[PDB]
UniProtKB/Swiss-Prot annotation:
Present with 49600 molecules/cell in log phase SD medium. Disulfide bonds: none annotated. It comes from the Eukaryota. Residues 28-100 form the RRM domain. Interacts with NAB2. It is found in: Cytoplasm; Nucleus; Cytoplasm, P-body; Cytoplasm, Stress granule. The gene is PUB1. This is Nuclear and cytoplasmic polyadenylated RNA-binding protein PUB1.
Length: 101
């Protein structure tokens, strides 16, 4: 097999690999729940961008959830595990695959 392995300093593709298995390789959206009312895109959009790229971010403070769209699916898997039960402005957030609900 060709030498193709990605071992980044942050986030692990292993524990994240299981995430993708819970969704199609086509879809590429990161769902973050448990967001405070004082959480705007100005502080969130960039909090996710650092991951890769954001073509469209949907923040819903009225419900406490946001959906970030990336270029590839693997891009969402990274932030997915990284945001998994991660601290944010004192409050922790959630992670998952953008779903109706």
């Amino acid at each position: 097999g060709s030498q193709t392995i990605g071992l980044p300093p942050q986030v692990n593709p292993q524990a994240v690999d299981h995430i993708i298995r819970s969704a199609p390789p086509r879809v590429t959206t990161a769902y973050i729940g448990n967001i405070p009312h004082f959480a705007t895109e100005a502080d969130l959009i960039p909090l996710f961008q650092n991951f890769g790229f954001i073509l469209d971010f949907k923040h819903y403070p009225e419900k406490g959830c946001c959906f970030i769209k990336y270029d590839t699916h693997e891009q969402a898997a990274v932030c997915i595990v990284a945001l998994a039960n991660f601290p944010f402005q004192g409050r922790n957030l959630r992670t998952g695959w953008g779903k109706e609900r």
